[PDB]
Amino acid sequence: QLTEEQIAEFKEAFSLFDKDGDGTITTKELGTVMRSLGQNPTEAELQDMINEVDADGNGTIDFPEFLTMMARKMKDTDSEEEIREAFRVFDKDGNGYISAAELRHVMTNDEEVDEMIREADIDGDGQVNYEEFVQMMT
Amino acid sequence: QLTEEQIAEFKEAFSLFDKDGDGTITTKELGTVMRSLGQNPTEAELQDMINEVDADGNGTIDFPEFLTMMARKMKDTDSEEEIREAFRVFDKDGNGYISAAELRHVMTNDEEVDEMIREADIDGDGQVNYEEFVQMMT
Amino acid sequence: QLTEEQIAEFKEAFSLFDKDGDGTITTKELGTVMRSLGQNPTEAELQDMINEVDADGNGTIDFPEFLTMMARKMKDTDSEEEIREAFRVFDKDGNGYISAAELRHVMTNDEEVDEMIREADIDGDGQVNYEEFVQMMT
Amino acid sequence: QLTEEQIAEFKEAFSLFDKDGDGTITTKELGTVMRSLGQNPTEAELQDMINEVDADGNGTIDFPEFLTMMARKMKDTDSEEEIREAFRVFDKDGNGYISAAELRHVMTNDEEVDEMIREADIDGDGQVNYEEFVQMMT
Amino acid sequence: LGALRRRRALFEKRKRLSDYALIFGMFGIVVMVIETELSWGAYDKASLYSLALKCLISLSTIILLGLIIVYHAREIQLFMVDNGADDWRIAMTYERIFFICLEILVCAIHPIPGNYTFTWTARLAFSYAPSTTTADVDIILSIPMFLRLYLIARVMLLHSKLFTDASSRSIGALNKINFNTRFVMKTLMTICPGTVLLVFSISLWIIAAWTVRACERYHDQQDVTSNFLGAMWLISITFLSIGYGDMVPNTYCGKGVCLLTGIMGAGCTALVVAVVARKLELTKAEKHVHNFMMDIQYTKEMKESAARVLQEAWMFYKHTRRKESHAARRHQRKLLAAINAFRQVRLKHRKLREQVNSMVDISKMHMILYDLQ
Amino acid sequence: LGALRRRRALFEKRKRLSDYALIFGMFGIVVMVIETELSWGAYDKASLYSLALKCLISLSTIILLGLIIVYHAREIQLFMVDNGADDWRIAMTYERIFFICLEILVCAIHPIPGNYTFTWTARLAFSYAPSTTTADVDIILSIPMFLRLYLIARVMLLHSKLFTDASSRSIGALNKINFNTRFVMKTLMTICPGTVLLVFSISLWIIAAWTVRACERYHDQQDVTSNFLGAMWLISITFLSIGYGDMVPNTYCGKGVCLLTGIMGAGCTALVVAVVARKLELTKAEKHVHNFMMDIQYTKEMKESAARVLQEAWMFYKHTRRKESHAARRHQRKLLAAINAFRQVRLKHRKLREQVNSMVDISKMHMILYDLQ
Amino acid sequence: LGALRRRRALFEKRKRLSDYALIFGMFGIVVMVIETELSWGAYDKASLYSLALKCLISLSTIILLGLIIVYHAREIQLFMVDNGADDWRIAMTYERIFFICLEILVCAIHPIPGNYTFTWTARLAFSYAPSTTTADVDIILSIPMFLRLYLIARVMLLHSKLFTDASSRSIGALNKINFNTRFVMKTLMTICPGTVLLVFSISLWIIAAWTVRACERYHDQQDVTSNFLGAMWLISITFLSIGYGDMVPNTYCGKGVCLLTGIMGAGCTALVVAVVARKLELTKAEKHVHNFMMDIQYTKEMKESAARVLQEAWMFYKHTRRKESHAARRHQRKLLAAINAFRQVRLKHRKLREQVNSMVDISKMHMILYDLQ
Amino acid sequence: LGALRRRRALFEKRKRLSDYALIFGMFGIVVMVIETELSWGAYDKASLYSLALKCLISLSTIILLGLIIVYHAREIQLFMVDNGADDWRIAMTYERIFFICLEILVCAIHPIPGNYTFTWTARLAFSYAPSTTTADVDIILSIPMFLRLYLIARVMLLHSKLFTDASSRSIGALNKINFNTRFVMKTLMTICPGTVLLVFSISLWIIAAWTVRACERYHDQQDVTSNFLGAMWLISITFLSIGYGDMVPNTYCGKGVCLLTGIMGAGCTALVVAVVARKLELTKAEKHVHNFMMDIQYTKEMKESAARVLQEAWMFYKHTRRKESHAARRHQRKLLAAINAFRQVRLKHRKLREQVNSMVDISKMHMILYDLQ
Ligand SMILES: [Ca+2]
Ligand SMILES: [Ca+2]
Ligand SMILES: [Ca+2]
Ligand SMILES: [Ca+2]
């Protein structure tokens, strides 16, 4: 486990994100912190970015989830975020499933991409999802 | 009377102030010209400044009245405006009549001011008005 | 006909103006593209500028009409636009028909202008329209 | 008592804060003076800062109260304001009473603070108020 | 309305008299330059050509001073018309009388006909050796003749359109604008700031170079600062504050002119840089087109950058499963570089959206307020 | 209220003591300059005129140090009144004691009566030859007497109206403004920035020129940098960072003064340019009049530019139909040029409307919000 | 649509001809530099190596002038396509013909084969001694060959993507943007202003240094300004307007080049400083993070500053009641300093909130207007 | 969470190794300066004191290179922890390997023990005379030891609080901020821009002055540029771009250092002026107090200016009716001047209201929008 000073500084950051001190980061607190930083996050994006690290799905970020997020964000570059962004920009239709037509389209900027599709479709659902994309990335 | 070129240029200025070309400067045209110049004139001030040169009192500025206003405003400094402003700043109460108390007050920034009041009250109404002020100024 | 690369780049421009990809430039798409460029076009001006090149009059700009507009706008200076603007500034009343009085007025900034009117009134309607103006210009 | 020139200049300042000249500084006049200075004071803060020097509690600032405030504010640094601000920042809960837990907390940035509490609780109410804080400060 | 006709008549006379004052003011300067150049080698100060040419400057100064006197007599009459005065003495203030005498004194300095000489001693530069020469007295009177260039500013103001137009006067009156020589200067620096600074710099270049050569021809026997082309280089390097090199003036006249050039060049170069800086800046309309095309470029770059992320990731996964080590390691290094490159273009795209929203901030505010109406 | 009367009484004494400290501070400097100039040629350091004049500086320094001691004794009493202290020792901090001793040390440096000499060796410029002279010891004590000019800043602050006015103090208190020597400096640079920079530059010009000449009169036997008029040129060219020319100081005192002039002139010229740049900029009211008259000018230009478009087009059409070739070709070239000229004025007019709307953006916002009320 | 195909075909030919004009334009310059360097010591002007190398420049000039003629013949045809003209004479204006002849004159200056000499007399710097030498006539023709660098700007414009892209043309047309050589210059100064200024400064550094050395090798017998490494130092110090030192040119060719370097360096350095100043400025996103962390720092500082206020106040009260005088006095001095320090951090925190609200002003305005919808 | 503990452990080792690299990096520089100064006059290069002191630099370079190798071995391990790599080869890129070798090459340059000499020939300034001397080979190796100052920037970044704080990292992550050496530079130029520029200028002053003196002691036999106090003056005047005077370097090492000083001083002075300009500018809170007191001053001036208008008008009317001519004329001149003075204060008051409304524009907008809620 982390040392005393690291735990203290991570608790300081958590309390910075937790105004009321109830121990969980409500989406309102994250929204007001982001607005204090000059950003204008909508409720949909706020909820989407608060459930990225919400492991238990209760709708709030407790201390272990914040610690995991910090472990993800302490490094200069996070591979998970970049892979997610690449998958997003691949998905032109925005449905969460990159079709074979989009896979062909993103290369023109035949057999190789077909092999990629064959080896990426782990569940055999006829398409590629985010979990398959990150499995292929690693 | 004025020459041809002077009349032409004064008509050009009048048409600049007269958008519709009806021959009279409605207060709306003066207001929109002033607003085009970055000023924000209220309706009360607009009407007050449009009847300063309105000789006939019809509520609009025809060509002779505009010519008189231009003759007043072509010089670098107009004495009438400065005398009017001095009378205004003298009138602290804003009723249009400068009382003897205000006349005494504006000097501290006895017999002489009493003589001024005696020789300025031409109509003997017990006070000093704008016409008496301009008579004393000239 | 145009080569493959020119057709591809013109299709790229058309798709830039055609967000939904339906194949026609609705006035809403042109309006949002113009607003993205800092302009504030009203609906009347938007419709007026979308029917300038709308040959079939269906209310939308298909690919051939966009190609014609691009052929008109690829050159540094377009003579049609300048002739149209000259005709517009000639038309003080804004009714689309430049009267003989306006033709006389725009020269003071007699027989020659009468000859111009006689040789420009091709249909003999007693006045000059835009088609007569462009016929005289060419 | 003060000399004639000092009284005159303090009356000039008071009349600067007293637009209507009724002899008392209504909270509206203080608010409009502060707004003229670029500040945005709420009604609650306005009332709170107008009763700081309001000795008689009538809700308005007369000339003696303004003179006392000026005597407090003519010096470069006023000790009362700084002691009040220190007490305020000590009071995290904002109830006006600094608890022993807050006294312990503000030192970590045992017997000594207990002695401070014992010698500061003059009335023996189990806590420390603003009057006790200023008594300890002096 | 009667004073409107008289005011225009008096202004036309003032404009006409200011034009003839510049004709005779510049004529005396030109003849002074011709006479100064020719009196050095062509003839001497005891020649009849020097008497004839210096009588032209003297005669032109008599006419120039007559035009200055009459011009100020018209300004007295215009003062009486504007201020409703009937006595000319009411216009005579201390500031007016001082400036009337100042213009006469400035315009009355010229080389008087006749040969008078004075002893001029100067300390040579870089050698600190005295050099005594018998110089003419017309050199200390020729240089002040360049002070007649103030009539150029008078002609510029009196020939300006907004100074007398009945439309600019009416519009300016509503906005309480003062139409003086300073307003004309400010409008010139906004319409054509480059032309004003370029013309001033070139005019100062020729005048200062000639003044340096004219003053430093008596104490220069080596054709260093007495050469016109060597004096133009000295004036230019002092203008740019580079230095003096070996062209250090031997006389305090040339040192004073070089000091004046350095002061003017300290501000002229800074103003020129500001003009160029605001001339290389994209306008609001041109910035929207640049941002629109940059956005399309960044969107296309993000498609190819993310495609490289997946292309390297698949090759890395393929080689790892295919029992390949050196190839898988190489494509993992490429995958990390592709992820970094994809992040970089994603961040520079995000900065562009921030810039686009920053400039399009108040225009969107207007649209919302229009909707509320 | 009792401390209000005492605070004003102590401030009046402080203002009175600061005035007399400047009277005796500047008197010692003036007598030092007189004695330094006359001790060179008029008499020698062993004369009774040098003893009498150096006893005037010494006597004025005794009085000046007495006024500094008493002034700081008033600041101790004002500290006790403001801070509610009854013991003078509570005011004695390390920073206060250091600055009290610093002022005494600065104000106690003056030429002591009596003739003492030291050996001054310097390396001549451009020849690198040593020059040993027996210099007086009063030259190394006369230069530091110019450090008494800090009393000018003390007098300026204590004579400032907003430093003690009961109206500025009350208004400043509401806005949490600190009325110190830095606030007075910032208000001076906003009210009269040109006057402050001009007075400072002229005062530095005379003082630095005299210091250079005073230090470089012992090692200058050719009247190069020892001349006052040749030292004013050196200070000015170094101020503008032009160069040194042949006026390179022979002593490290003159090199240090020239270095100080270069540092001050690096910023003074840049600040002066900024003042002039913001002085040549049209105000908001004057820009609206300029834009209004430009709009009328462009509308008239578009009428004549489009009239030329139709005039050339008709002539081109007439000649083409009239079986004319060379004339029709010539008027087609004119028609193309007329169309280009019409487009140019149309584009420069469009840029003016964009500029007009850019400046009139938030004023229109206020009008809409007023309507919604 | 037919003219769309022809316009693209003519633009491809123009781009191809501008590339070959730069190939032969730069080849002649390179051979000129090689021939100039080798004709000094390697061989003489009467050698067959000088005839062979000067016949390469002459042959490349014939081909270069042919490409300039053909390129302008393509611009005539593109003018006819764009303007709907069928006769080439309609394109022939006075401005076009003048610039066609200007390019030919510029590109036709080169060292003609054959040995011709002229007498070159110059005045040596710092000694003012004449130096007469028999110089070749190819040195006055080699320097103007650097004027062929205008073809670089032509190639840059013709190879630019937005100059011909059908997307930038359509977007620019909606915004009435003119795509000319000035628009490309403005976009280069916004995308990569540092790279443009750095490349220009380095290119000017080598070219000006070589021109100075080439001109001042005939009259320099001491390897001062004739040395390439001593000419690079002279160009750099003149670029920064430091001075000349002992590197004052002996010829007016080297004085003119140094003058050109001083003019370019006066603006290039000012533009570079502006680029660096805007590069060290925190962006809007980075300023919000800095302000957020500063706010947390100031809140923590206010807790420790007020804790010191109470800590010293209690010690002062304890010692005062405990019949202690020297200790109570010392802790009262500390209490006053703690109160001043607490006030200072409180004021610098208040300034931070003012800065935070100043930057977050229009974003909050947008949120309110969205709520009203 | 496991990599969080390892990342902090590896960062502490990196910070510890960067501190010891600066200890041994600066120690070698200090011993180099001591050995260079003493090897000139105290002893010779064949002494055992030179061998002992140059063995200290050599020994410290071995330890310094060991700390550089280990520090980069920690960066490899931190790369593996951050990027989830298990093989060290995946971290080895071309850019990383090049910079690892670059640091080793920079830090391995030092005076090798042993006496080796080379022939140094330079051209003397202002005389152009060759000067051949047998110089030690340790002077060309001592100067590059100042390139070890890059470790100062490494220590500054690694000791920075926001580089590792878990609060700044979380806040910066939400705003997509990159915490690199450039972000630390930008925050330093916003917090303390004056301190950064002052420390850099003073540090460069001592280092450049010592480098100039160290290089120009072999070819200077007149104590001109070999003097430390004469080299500090040369560096300062070149920093301010004043000139060189007689202090023109005799060696290309001193010319290169002076060129570097001129480039750094061209931007450092411009940045310093910008810092001072924004430091003399009144804040928003201080401008409201200044405008409030100016408004009260102008209102009082308008009362006295209009009172003079009526006072002179009444006296003029009284004298006119009292059959007085010279007195009435005099008071009519005063009445006109009083009217002009009243107009001037009225116009400068109107300008103040315009300035007050211009600054208070968006704050009033917020109040209106709050009311609509
Ligand atoms: Ca899909
Ligand atoms: Ca009244
Ligand atoms: Ca019509
Ligand atoms: Ca509490």
Q: How far apart are CA H325 and CA F218, in angstroms?
A: 67
D85 in contact with G, Cβ within 8 Å: yes
Beta-strand runs (E) in H11-154: 117-123, 130-136
Q: Which of B19, B40, B42 to mutate to test the interface with F (most CBs of F within 10 A)?
A: B40
Give strand pairing partners of G117. G136
CA of A49 to the centre of ligand 1 (A): 22
Q: Closest partner residue to C37 among G7, G83, G175, by Cβ? A: G175
CA distance, residue A39 to nearest chain G CA (Å): 9
3-state secondary structure of D41: coil
State the binding site of B: 18, 20, 22, 24, 29, 54, 56, 58, 60, 65, 91, 93, 95, 97, 102, 121, 123, 125, 127, 132
Q: What angle do CA E296, E305, C12 make, to 5 degrees?
A: 30
Please tell me the experimental approach by which this structure was elucidated: cryo-EM
The identity of residue G288, as a single letter, is H
Query: If you ran DSSP here, which 8-state letter would residue E147 be given?
Result: G
3-state secondary structure of G122: strand
Q: How far apart are CA H127 and CA H150, in angstroms?
A: 39
Is the distance from CB of F316 to CB of F286 less than 8 angstroms? no
CA distance, residue D110 to nearest chain H CA (Å): 30
Resolution of the experimental structure, in angstroms: 3.1
Q: Which helix (H) or strand (E) holds F131?
A: strand F130-136
Fold entry, domain F284-372: Helix Hairpins (1.10.287)
3-state secondary structure of H130: strand
Report the residue count for chain C.
Answer: 138
Q: How far apart are CA H42 and CA H49, in angstroms?
A: 10
G340 in contact with D, Cβ within 8 Å: yes
Is the distance from CB of B29 to CB of B20 less than 8 angstroms? yes
Helices (H) and strands (E) in chain D, counts: 8, 0
Is the distance from CB of H104 to CB of H65 less than 8 angstroms? yes
Domains of chain C by start residue, with CATH: 3-76 (1.10.238.10), 77-137 (1.10.238.10)
Q: Which helix (H) or strand (E) holds E343?
A: helix E326-359
Query: If you ran DSSP here, which 8-state letter would residue G217 be given?
Result: T
Q: Closest partner residue to F306 among C77, C79, C86, by Cβ? A: C86
3-state secondary structure of C128: strand
Give strand pairing partners of G131. G122
Q: How far apart are CA H146 and CA B98, in angstroms?
A: 82
Q: Using CB atoms and an 8 Å cut-off, which of residues 242-281 of chain G contact chain E? A: 242-244, 248, 252, 255, 258-259, 262-263, 266-267, 270-271, 274
3-state secondary structure of H327: helix
G351 in contact with D, Cβ within 8 Å: no
Q: Which helix (H) or strand (E) holds E17?
A: helix E2-41
Beta carbons of E246 and G128 less than 8 Å apart: yes
Tally of CB atoms within 10 A around E58: 15
Inter-residue long-range contacts of C116-119, CB under 8 Å, 24+ positions, other chains counted: C116/F314, C119/F314, C119/F317, C119/F318
Q: Closest partner residue to H329 among E83, E89, E329, by Cβ? A: E89
**Cα dist from G366 to E367, G164, G338, G372, H366, whole Å:** 11, 39, 43, 10, 11
H237 in contact with F, Cβ within 8 Å: yes
Q: How far apart are CA H331 and CA A33, in angstroms?
A: 71
Is the distance from CB of H225 to CB of H257 less than 8 angstroms? no
Give strand pairing partners of F123. F130
Q: How far apart are CA H67 and CA H70, in angstroms?
A: 5
Q: What angle do CA F172, F176, F181 make, to 5 degrees?
A: 70
CA distance from start to end of chain B: 27
- Kindly identify the ligand whose nearest atom is closest to the C-alpha of C98: 3
The identity of residue G206, as a single letter, is I
Closest CA to H205 of H237, H245, H227: H237
Question: Strands G117-123 and G130-136: what pairing?
Answer: antiparallel
Beta carbons of H342 and B82 less than 8 Å apart: yes
Give strand pairing partners of G133. G120
Is the distance from CB of E81 to CB of E7 less than 8 angstroms? yes
Residue of E nearest to B37 (CA): E175
Pick left, alpha or beta for residue G122 (phi over 0 → left; psi -120 to 50 → alpha; otherwise beta): beta
| Crossing angle for the helix pair D130-137 and G284-321, to the nearest 10 degrees | 70
| H370 CB burial (10 A radius; 0-12, 13-18, 19+) | exposed
**Cα dist from C98 to C95, C126, C127, E68, F301, whole Å:** 8, 10, 7, 54, 19
Query: If you ran DSSP here, which 8-state letter would residue F51 be given?
Result: H
Encoded tokens for E298: 């960044």
CA distance, residue F173 to nearest chain D CA (Å): 7
Q: How far apart are CA H164 and CA H183, in angstroms?
A: 13
CA of C134 to the centre of ligand 3 (A): 16
CA distance, residue G363 to nearest chain A CA (Å): 8
Report the residue count for chain E.
Answer: 373
E182 in contact with B, Cβ within 8 Å: no
Q: Which helix (H) or strand (E) holds C7?
A: helix C4-17
Inter-residue long-range contacts of F60-67, CB under 8 Å, 24+ positions, other chains counted: F60/F24, F60/F27, F60/F28, F60/F31, F61/F24, F61/F28, F61/F107, F61/F108, F61/F110, F63/F24, F64/F21, F64/F24, F64/F25, F64/F28, F64/F107, F64/F148, F65/F104, F65/F107, F65/F108, F67/F17, F67/F20, F67/F21, F67/F24
Q: Which single residue is written with the structure tokens 């070589």?
A: G210
State the binding site of D for Ca(2+): 18, 20, 22, 24, 29, 54, 56, 58, 60, 65, 91, 93, 95, 97, 102, 121, 123, 125, 127, 132
Rg (CA), chain G: 34
Closest CA to E165 of F285, B73, B18: B73
Q: How far apart are CA F327 and CA G36, in angstroms?
A: 53
Instruction: Find chain B residues with C-beta within 8 A of H328's C-beta.
Output: none
Q: Which helix (H) or strand (E) holds H215?
A: helix H193-215
**Is chain A touching chain E, with at least 3 CB–CB pairs below 8 Å?**
yes
Residue of A nearest to E311 (CA): A107
Q: How far apart are CA E47 and CA F127, in angstroms?
A: 47
Q: Which helix (H) or strand (E) holds D83?
A: helix D79-90
The identity of residue H4, as a single letter, is L
The contacts of residue G202 (CB under 8 Å, 6+ apart) are none
Is the distance from CB of F7 to CB of D77 less than 8 angstroms? no
Task: Give the burial string for H35-65 (b: 16+ CB within 10 Å, else e).
Answer: bbeebeeeeebeeeebeebbebbeebbebbb
3-state secondary structure of A20: coil
**Max Cα separation, chain C?**
57
Q: Closest partner residue to H83 among E329, E336, E347, by Cβ? A: E336
Task: Give the burial string for H322-342 (b: 16+ CB within 10 Å, else e).
Answer: eeeeeebbbbbbbbbebbebb
**Is chain G touching chain H, with at least 3 CB–CB pairs below 8 Å?**
yes
Give strand pairing partners of H135. H118
Q: Using CB atoms and an 8 Å cut-off, which of residues 27-66 of chain D contact chain H? A: 36-38, 40
Residue of G nearest to H170 (CA): G289
Q: Which helix (H) or strand (E) holds F135?
A: strand F130-136
Rg (CA), chain H: 34
Please report the sign of the dihedral spanned by the C-alpha atoms of residue H245, residue H249, residue H250, residue H255. negative
Pick left, alpha or beta for residue C38 (phi over 0 → left; psi -120 to 50 → alpha; otherwise beta): left
Instruction: Find chain C residues with C-beta within 8 A of E363's C-beta.
Output: 38, 40
Beta carbons of E168 and F289 less than 8 Å apart: yes
| F340 CB burial (10 A radius; 0-12, 13-18, 19+) | middle
Closest CA to E210 of E153, E148, E150, E139: E139
Neighbour subunits, A (≥3 Cβ pairs < 8 A): E, G, H
The contacts of residue E112 (CB under 8 Å, 6+ apart) are E54, E58, E138, E141
Tally of CB atoms within 10 A around E305: 24
Residue of F nearest to C108 (CA): F304
Beta carbons of E82 and B37 less than 8 Å apart: no
Q: Closest partner residue to F289 among B16, B37, B40, by Cβ? A: B37
CA distance from start to end of chain E: 47
The contacts of residue E253 (CB under 8 Å, 6+ apart) are E143, E211, E212, E215, E216
Q: Using CB atoms and an 8 Å cut-off, which of residues 94-153 of chain H contact chain A? A: none
Beta carbons of F342 and C85 less than 8 Å apart: yes
Is the distance from CB of F267 to CB of H272 less than 8 angstroms? yes
Is the distance from CB of G250 to CB of G216 less than 8 angstroms? yes
Is the distance from CB of H5 to CB of A3 less than 8 angstroms? yes
**Is chain E touching chain F, with at least 3 CB–CB pairs below 8 Å?**
yes
Is the distance from CB of E3 to CB of B79 less than 8 angstroms? no
Residue A20 annotated as lining a ligand binding site = yes
Closest CA to H265 of H294, H237, H288: H237
CA distance, residue D37 to nearest chain H CA (Å): 5
Beta carbons of G238 and E236 less than 8 Å apart: no
Is the distance from CB of C91 to CB of C102 less than 8 angstroms? yes
Neighbour subunits, C (≥3 Cβ pairs < 8 A): E, F, G
Is the distance from CB of B72 to CB of E7 less than 8 angstroms? no
On the CB side of C98, how many CA atoms lie within 13 Å of its CA? Answer: 24
Instruction: Find chain F residues with C-beta within 8 A of G347's C-beta.
Output: 176, 178
Is the distance from CB of E212 to CB of E225 less than 8 angstroms? yes
B83 in contact with H, Cβ within 8 Å: yes
The contacts of residue H328 (CB under 8 Å, 6+ apart) are H316, H319, H320
Beta carbons of E165 and B9 less than 8 Å apart: yes
Report the residue count for chain A.
Answer: 138
F199 in contact with H, Cβ within 8 Å: no
| G262 CB burial (10 A radius; 0-12, 13-18, 19+) | buried
> What are the φ/ψ torsions at residue E282 (nearest 5 degrees)?
-65, 140
Q: How far apart are CA D88 and CA D93, in angstroms?
A: 10
Q: What angle do CA A62, A66, A68 make, to 5 degrees?
A: 120
The identity of residue G333, as a single letter, is R
On the CB side of H50, how many CA atoms lie within 13 Å of its CA? Answer: 20
| F106 CB burial (10 A radius; 0-12, 13-18, 19+) | middle
Pick left, alpha or beta for residue H245 (phi over 0 → left; psi -120 to 50 → alpha; otherwise beta): left
Q: How far apart are CA H123 and CA F58, in angstroms?
A: 54
What is the distance of C-alpha E50 from the center of its chain? 36
The contacts of residue C73 (CB under 8 Å, 6+ apart) are G169, G170, G173
Instruction: Find chain C residues with C-beta within 8 A of E290's C-beta.
Output: none
